[PDB]
RNA sequence: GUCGCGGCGCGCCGAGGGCCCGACGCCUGGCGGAGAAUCAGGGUUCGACUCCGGAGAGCGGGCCUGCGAGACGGCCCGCACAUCCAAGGACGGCAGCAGGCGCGGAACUUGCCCAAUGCGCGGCGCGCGAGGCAGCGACGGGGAGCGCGCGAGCGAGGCGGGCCCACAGCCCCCGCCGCGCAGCCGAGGGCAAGGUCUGUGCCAGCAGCCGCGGUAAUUCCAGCUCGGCGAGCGUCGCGCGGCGCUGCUGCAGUUGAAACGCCCGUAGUUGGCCCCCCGCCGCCACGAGGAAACGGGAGCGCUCCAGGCAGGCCCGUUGGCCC
């Protein structure tokens, strides 16, 4: 009754068992300053998924090389990480997946890919620009700063076709 | 009286190795002890074992090469799913690479590695590393 | 008359003087707050590091913030 | 002790656990059902109540103070609770026989701190939380 | 630009129609309405009768507009009148809308008529 | 007798049937499983509600109709507790949906429609408080904000559209107008953050715990600073982990809690070796068959996501496969 009940949801963010550790806390502030993260919840989502992917590689470790399940899952797990551009394309092995750190997940951010493209020359300005949707991924305007661009779309990401740089109309201060 | 004979003998073998004695006399002898000793001799943790046959239970004289850390019995002889034999090794044996859990299978008494090689579960006689 | 009890209800809360809040500007709530806390510690290393870091609330570190 | 370990001794192992699992005071409190029947807050986070009287309790030594408290009769079980009103001077906010919500001190039915005999403490008075009254966020 | 190429065309002999996916690649400002888009839709459909074409479901995507809609184009207007959900046909004026009761009013009258 | 087997009812004839491998009796703030929570492994805990199967429609009975109900939005009666009333009589049943009340710490609109999703009725469309849709809605889950720039620029909003929709709406897309907008616990430790000024003086208070306060409080009442989390933060109850402090893995008993004072003993449990070669065991592997959701997982850009099984110029497009 009410298929709204049938819709599901998941916990994507994991809090530290030890809440107050001064060395870990300060490092999280560095990550938050360097990658322009909003709150430590932001970091938790990335930390959780790094853990699960590495855990999947460890589950595959206890399987024999080329096991029907090991080969099928192994191909897919490696494929998604280099498909997103997170893991070294050439390695494609479980051991290389084990070394991945949340910095890779932070690098996939659309707001991160802008500071490398020199569009906003500031993670905090990239965040600001994405909020005004002045950056478009290949014909898709994005208001969300964690688009997680797949490797191919780095060429596509550019200033939006809507008024901004090379403007469609009047943007911002010229408009106002 | 003696309900487990393997355990009593293996404890003696470990006790002799502690005081650095090569030759041990095991007072009770059994086919399971015989097979357990044969597997250890193959893996070279023990040397030649000579059974002095008597008109009773039999005694075994075992020459030790000084290369066994520890042996043991699992009582009762549990039933192990072939899939979960790894869990038994992870806890009882140190390191996946070194150490032998000795099993019994309808095919025969066999090594945990051999049990994995044909994926057949069984009962654990004991363990040696 | 040391116990006081129900007759001493209130007491130090009622006796206390009221010192006013000093008017302050808002903080940059947002990732910006994380950005500015980072510029307080890891970037600059002057506000906390008098030669070496002294801790966020050290008395020497105060007054260098005008406090 | 051999801890009965035979392949056919699985009723003995089960029996021993069920009988000796009752020795633990915490498992006993949790699964005996004695707490549920005897709890003034029986399986409830909190309960409504009238203040029997406003009486301070002298604190256990070394600490020396009269911690103002209110005796409270519960609507649900008609049992009398001694509830410590918290913060400073908050007893004044309460009047005798006012509506009061009371929650446990946080030690799960055990007394917290120097207050003697205080399994619970006052959270709200006549619809207004005592902190809200204390901070003046919401007045009486 | 009204780039309505029209995809996933399916002729339905049963309903005497040819329903089809529709994509409008318009940059910047919104496409100017469903009915104006319909004139181009008929040309791409090649049905050649303006009345039997109608698009159910239009959504403009976030940022760039690549709206996907499903135009029902029929061989005959009378096939459209025999087989069209009344509410959509009410919106297009093909059929008029005899306004009903409150559904509750039908229930209240039903209860009294049952009482007879 | 029943649709039918049966102590299922009846006569008759015997003397059984159960049990320390716990019967019977009693109790249960006992629906059961699919599942859920927590988590190395093993465990533990919970099964109101989605799916399934049961069981009931205030409480007992008893019934006809029917293909099927011991039906309660059928009837009949006993028992409560009601309502209409002209006092003669009549007539009940929200463990349907809103809504009232009682109670409890605790829980939504007397809201709108059959158009899907089904079903009822018959080839030509209506019925459905099933269901959908909106309202309330910090149960909770997820995505963005409160800036940034030297002056760059929105979205939150507003106003008309487009479109959506049973109609509304909301989203999104357009043009214009453009109002960024934070808290809640703490700093003696555990446990992150003041060898600052006020008050107070074992008082008031604080403090899960150890502790602070007795006139110079790092612990209170304030100011100031600073910390942690974050549109959430605190508080209380409970489950799990912690806790190998329940111990199968895996606990202890000389002295911290704990070998019965001693011995025989029935059940129970445990039983040296020894026969290769089959027979039944147990045991282990391998099948077969038995719903999904769910957990995992392939494939996939909901603008990102929590999602969903979609999508795309297509495996016979997919939605495998495991549980």
XYZ file of C-alpha atoms (C1' of nucleotides) in Angstrom, chain F residues 6-318:
313
model
C -9.699 -39.660 10.995
C -12.354 -40.479 18.250
C -14.616 -36.536 13.973
C -19.624 -37.981 17.074
C -21.736 -42.573 18.857
C -22.237 -47.538 20.905
C -19.001 -51.751 21.818
C -14.232 -53.947 23.335
C -9.713 -53.843 25.603
C -5.665 -51.156 28.178
C -3.203 -47.984 26.764
C -0.773 -43.106 25.153
C 2.926 -39.626 27.173
C 7.694 -38.405 30.108
C 15.071 -35.929 33.463
C 16.351 -36.745 24.857
C 12.118 -32.042 30.565
C 6.400 -34.782 29.543
C 2.170 -32.512 31.858
C 1.075 -28.043 34.252
C 1.765 -22.754 34.310
C 3.213 -18.010 32.231
C 4.056 -14.763 27.926
C 3.810 -5.703 27.671
C 3.851 -14.474 22.532
C 1.358 -13.357 15.328
C 4.874 -16.470 12.418
C 8.383 -16.506 8.523
C 10.479 -13.408 3.997
C 13.267 -10.153 6.604
C 15.378 -5.914 10.106
C 19.284 -3.649 13.517
C 24.435 -4.122 15.086
C 28.627 -5.985 13.288
C 36.433 -9.260 11.769
C 34.752 -14.437 12.520
C 31.324 -16.537 15.547
C 27.390 -14.465 17.772
C 23.442 -11.119 19.704
C 18.917 -8.638 19.178
C 14.076 -7.706 16.903
C 10.144 -9.690 14.256
C 2.749 -4.336 14.610
C 2.955 -2.315 9.206
C 4.700 -3.203 2.544
C 5.396 -9.721 0.623
C 3.427 -14.258 2.044
C 0.691 -17.455 5.242
C -2.428 -17.429 9.637
C -6.464 -15.189 12.914
C -10.227 -11.736 14.140
C -13.788 -8.040 13.043
C -17.180 -5.212 21.253
C -17.813 -10.254 23.439
C -19.621 -15.358 23.171
C -22.548 -18.574 20.181
C -25.878 -20.062 16.049
C -27.188 -19.524 10.861
C -29.080 -19.010 5.665
C -27.566 -17.326 0.758
C -23.996 -18.982 -2.344
C -19.315 -22.204 -6.470
C -17.120 -20.846 -2.120
C -18.380 -17.102 4.251
C -19.769 -20.665 10.287
C -19.421 -13.530 6.404
C -20.299 -9.351 10.877
C -19.870 -2.098 5.664
C -25.358 -10.444 5.911
C -28.925 -12.288 9.393
C -30.437 -14.407 14.385
C -29.856 -14.903 19.760
C -27.342 -14.568 24.812
C -24.019 -10.737 27.205
C -22.223 -5.748 27.765
C -22.233 -0.602 26.120
C -25.208 2.536 23.284
C -28.589 5.954 19.690
C -33.625 7.609 17.472
C -38.420 8.364 20.142
C -44.497 11.077 19.540
C -42.849 6.420 25.106
C -46.142 2.996 21.681
C -41.806 1.411 19.604
C -37.554 1.315 16.611
C -32.208 0.606 15.428
C -26.404 -0.399 16.375
C -20.533 -2.180 15.569
C -14.446 3.389 11.987
C -8.957 -3.615 14.372
C -12.033 0.685 5.960
C -10.848 6.392 4.968
C -10.713 11.208 6.972
C -12.242 13.011 11.695
C -13.824 12.970 17.246
C -12.697 11.173 22.228
C -10.137 8.240 26.110
C -5.216 7.068 27.034
C -0.037 7.460 26.477
C 6.168 10.543 26.245
C 4.473 9.673 21.225
C 1.952 9.800 15.628
C -1.239 13.440 9.523
C -6.444 16.440 5.938
C -14.392 15.127 8.262
C -8.572 16.990 1.390
C -9.084 15.846 -4.164
C -9.920 11.850 -8.555
C -10.734 7.064 -10.999
C -6.766 9.152 -15.844
C -3.110 5.593 -15.030
C -1.995 0.735 -11.090
C -5.271 -2.962 -10.815
C -10.180 -5.133 -9.964
C -15.853 -5.629 -10.429
C -19.529 -5.689 -14.200
C -21.122 -7.425 -20.162
C -17.195 -5.833 -26.477
C -18.404 -0.623 -26.871
C -17.737 3.008 -19.464
C -18.804 3.528 -15.275
C -18.066 1.865 -9.788
C -13.928 1.772 -6.197
C -11.681 6.800 1.372
C -8.547 -0.111 -3.389
C -4.986 2.906 -5.583
C -3.269 7.673 -7.423
C -2.736 12.872 -6.457
C -2.047 17.012 -3.419
C -2.032 18.932 2.431
C 0.362 18.345 7.186
C 5.105 16.070 7.965
C 13.351 17.983 11.218
C 10.770 9.397 11.658
C 14.559 9.684 8.683
C 17.763 9.512 3.885
C 20.216 12.485 -0.073
C 21.721 16.897 -2.850
C 23.029 21.830 -2.746
C 23.513 27.522 0.430
C 24.955 31.615 3.573
C 29.775 33.694 -0.707
C 32.909 35.404 -4.073
C 35.351 38.963 -6.764
C 38.306 43.865 -7.212
C 33.848 44.234 -8.250
C 32.966 39.288 -11.095
C 28.063 36.734 -10.326
C 23.738 34.074 -9.139
C 19.621 30.956 -6.410
C 16.415 31.667 -2.562
C 12.504 34.237 -3.799
C 8.597 37.405 -6.564
C 5.698 38.105 -11.679
C 3.921 36.437 -16.373
C 4.577 32.312 -19.672
C 6.225 27.166 -21.599
C 5.094 22.596 -19.762
C 3.263 19.152 -16.181
C -1.120 17.400 -14.243
C -8.175 13.723 -13.645
C -7.464 19.173 -12.929
C -4.287 21.715 -9.981
C 0.308 22.213 -8.269
C 5.814 21.131 -7.279
C 10.138 20.531 -10.178
C 12.591 22.172 -14.426
C 12.967 25.430 -18.606
C 12.205 30.608 -20.250
C 12.027 36.345 -20.142
C 11.831 40.141 -16.278
C 12.767 41.094 -11.242
C 16.342 39.766 -8.782
C 15.620 40.492 -0.406
C 22.725 34.801 1.165
C 19.816 33.781 4.978
C 23.000 29.195 11.172
C 22.631 27.111 14.884
C 23.354 23.646 19.010
C 26.537 21.464 22.761
C 31.157 22.229 25.105
C 37.171 24.112 26.606
C 40.308 20.352 34.241
C 40.797 15.301 32.173
C 38.552 10.951 29.517
C 37.781 14.245 24.867
C 38.912 18.557 20.491
C 39.173 23.766 22.675
C 41.730 29.942 27.368
C 48.589 28.830 33.343
C 42.276 35.673 30.260
C 38.653 39.315 33.318
C 33.583 38.996 36.362
C 30.459 37.740 40.149
C 29.828 33.783 44.176
C 32.162 31.624 48.458
C 30.745 23.553 50.082
C 26.042 28.628 48.994
C 24.116 28.796 44.161
C 25.251 25.479 40.997
C 28.262 22.037 37.917
C 29.441 17.096 37.111
C 27.100 10.101 32.408
C 32.502 8.999 35.315
C 36.773 10.775 38.078
C 35.911 15.250 40.051
C 34.911 21.167 40.913
C 32.752 25.162 44.426
C 34.929 26.337 52.045
C 36.780 34.487 49.688
C 42.991 34.285 44.402
C 36.950 28.118 40.831
C 41.489 25.847 34.320
C 34.892 22.630 36.691
C 29.543 27.448 38.700
C 26.850 32.808 36.976
C 28.390 36.076 33.219
C 31.758 38.607 29.356
C 35.774 37.407 26.088
C 38.166 34.013 23.169
C 38.382 29.090 21.200
C 36.807 24.055 19.893
C 33.461 20.109 17.683
C 29.678 19.072 14.531
C 26.632 21.223 11.105
C 20.505 23.077 9.050
C 21.269 20.500 12.172
C 22.874 20.082 17.319
C 21.699 18.639 22.241
C 18.585 15.297 25.873
C 16.110 10.596 27.595
C 14.687 5.260 26.764
C 16.170 0.688 24.232
C 18.922 -2.950 20.903
C 23.928 -4.100 19.174
C 28.909 -3.453 19.453
C 32.197 -2.362 23.278
C 32.374 -6.987 26.803
C 36.714 -13.167 25.471
C 32.052 -8.741 31.555
C 28.156 -15.257 28.918
C 33.157 -17.553 26.672
C 31.131 -23.238 20.308
C 35.292 -20.285 18.596
C 36.621 -18.089 23.690
C 35.862 -17.107 30.590
C 37.115 -18.230 35.374
C 36.937 -21.467 40.592
C 44.736 -22.221 45.716
C 44.564 -16.901 47.544
C 39.903 -11.462 43.673
C 33.090 -14.620 42.962
C 33.348 -19.964 42.685
C 35.294 -28.114 43.351
C 29.336 -30.438 46.089
C 32.341 -32.887 53.395
C 32.861 -37.847 51.532
C 31.464 -42.285 48.628
C 28.263 -45.802 45.665
C 25.123 -44.902 41.814
C 20.549 -44.849 37.355
C 19.596 -41.756 33.327
C 22.993 -38.576 30.576
C 27.668 -37.856 28.248
C 32.241 -39.980 27.050
C 34.418 -44.352 25.764
C 42.227 -48.394 24.057
C 43.610 -50.634 19.903
C 41.828 -53.752 16.184
C 39.066 -56.574 10.278
C 40.882 -52.429 4.372
C 37.052 -53.386 0.289
C 29.405 -54.391 1.836
C 25.050 -53.138 4.615
C 22.716 -49.402 7.038
C 24.527 -45.125 9.607
C 25.848 -40.296 10.638
C 29.631 -37.177 7.586
C 31.290 -34.685 3.087
C 30.876 -33.161 -1.905
C 27.622 -32.753 -6.277
C 23.012 -32.084 -8.394
C 17.450 -31.451 -8.946
C 13.101 -28.717 -7.506
C 10.746 -25.078 -4.695
C 7.993 -16.154 -5.575
C 9.789 -11.626 -5.606
C 11.099 -7.446 -2.841
C 15.552 -7.774 0.252
C 21.337 -8.154 0.679
C 25.016 -8.275 -2.982
C 26.001 -7.331 -8.035
C 26.161 -6.545 -14.171
C 24.566 -2.544 -17.376
C 22.917 2.579 -17.162
C 24.780 10.215 -16.455
C 18.079 11.186 -12.097
C 22.154 18.067 -14.059
C 25.088 15.383 -9.120
C 22.964 12.292 -5.558
C 19.672 9.348 -2.316
C 17.328 7.161 -6.953
C 15.255 3.979 -10.848
C 15.476 -0.529 -14.306
C 15.920 2.176 -17.140
C 17.537 3.410 -21.717
C 19.156 3.943 -26.793
C 19.724 5.268 -33.416
C 19.910 -1.151 -29.611
C 22.054 -9.347 -26.987
C 15.771 -11.308 -30.286
C 18.172 -3.522 -26.481
C 18.497 -4.660 -21.310
